[PDB]
Structure formats: structure tokens, C-alpha cells
């Protein structure tokens, strides 16, 4: 009885099995369909890929090879849709976007 992961069937990286287990244990519904965890895992993987792309670009702009929370803050806040999704979220050691009001500039 050779075991093949459900994640390997759909070409995903995330643990579909773990997602299914968390769905069952979370009391979200009386029963859980089989197709739901695949969809959820694909969505999570896509969002993580987008975040990592933007963070990597921001980190490379700073001439560093490690993604630090500052890069994540810059990537999240510099994108309209990601900022809208995470409007109420605070990131530890994130800093602020560089911007200065026009009127405060010297005359």
C-alpha cells in the first residue's frame, strides 16, 4: 500500500491533508467535502506566491539577499489590493512608507 499525497496529485506545495484535518477539527461545519481542501490550498499558495514575489523584489532593491519584515511591510503597503486586504493588520518591526507632506517642505 504505497502512499501518494493528495497535494502531489494536484501539483501543489501546501499540505492538502493538513488543511482537511484543520477543516474537520475547526467545527466549521458538520461535514466537509473532498473538493474544498484542494481549492483552499491552491488559494493559499497563490497568495503566498504573490506576497513572496513582491517581498523579494523589495529586498533586492535594497541590495540584500534575505527577506526581513521591512521588505514585507514595503511590499504589502506599496500594492493597492494587498494593502486593501491587510488594512487593519500591523506587522512587527515593519516601519512606515517613506512620504513627506508637500506643505512641510521648505519654502
Amino acid at each position: 500500500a504505497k502512499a501518494k499525497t493528495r497535494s502531489s496529485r494536484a501539483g501543489l506545495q501546501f499540505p492538502v491533508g493538513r488543511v482537511h484535518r484543520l477543516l474537520r477539527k475547526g467545527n466549521y461545519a458538520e461535514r466537509v467535502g473532498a473538493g474544498a481542501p484542494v481549492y483552499l490550498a491552491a488559494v493559499l499558495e497563490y497568495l503566498t506566491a504573490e506576497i513572496l514575489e513582491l517581498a523579494g523584489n523589495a529586498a533586492r532593491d535594497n541590495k540584500k539577499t534575505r527577506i526581513i519584515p521591512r521588505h514585507l511591510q514595503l511590499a504589502v503597503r506599496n500594492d493597492e489590493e494587498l494593502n486593501k486586504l491587510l488594512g487593519r493588520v500591523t506587522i512587527a518591526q515593519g516601519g512606515v512608507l517613506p512620504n513627506i507632506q508637500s506643505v512641510l517642505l521648505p519654502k
Binding site: 519584515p69 487593519r88 493588520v89 500591523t90 512587527a92 518591526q93 513627506i100 512641510l104
Partner: protein
């Protein structure tokens, strides 16, 4: 016994915080109002966290209690699990 440690938030600290926020010129009465606002916010968050801790019959406030209290307020915080 600790008393009147709200004065521990010195004027230069508030000045630095305002500088980070993009403030150029600051009045003299800002500091007291800022201290009051900070005290109110900390009171609310600590009250929720202490209630969470009391429910679990523990005597040590953990990071998860603070994170949950913040999430209840709508101030979701990442990085501390």
C-alpha cells in the same frame, strides 16, 4: 510600589514618534494628551488580556493573550504567533 510611571514616556520619545509620523512642528500641550491617549489604549488592551488570563486560571500573561486581545479590538498583530 510603582506610582506615576506615566512620566516615564519622556518628551523626546513622543517627539521621535511624531517625527516618524511626518510631523514638522509640535506644540507644547501635545505631550499630556498623547500620554492620556496611550494610557487609555493600554488600559483597554491590558484589561482584555487580563480577563483572558483569568479565564485560564493562570498567573502569567502570555503573548497569545495579548494577541487575542488585540484581535478583539480589530488591531490584528503578526509576528508573535
Amino acid at each position: 510600589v510603582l506610582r506615576d510611571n506615566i512620566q516615564g514616556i519622556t518628551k523626546p520619545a513622543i517627539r521621535r514618534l511624531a517625527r516618524r509620523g511626518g510631523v514638522k512642528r509640535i506644540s507644547g500641550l501635545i505631550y499630556e494628551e498623547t500620554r492620556g491617549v496611550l494610557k487609555v489604549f493600554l488600559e483597554n488592551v491590558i484589561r482584555d488580556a487580563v480577563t483572558y488570563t483569568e479565564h485560564a486560571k493562570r498567573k502569567t500573561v502570555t503573548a497569545m493573550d495579548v494577541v487575542y486581545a488585540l484581535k478583539r479590538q480589530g488591531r490584528t498583530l503578526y509576528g508573535f504567533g
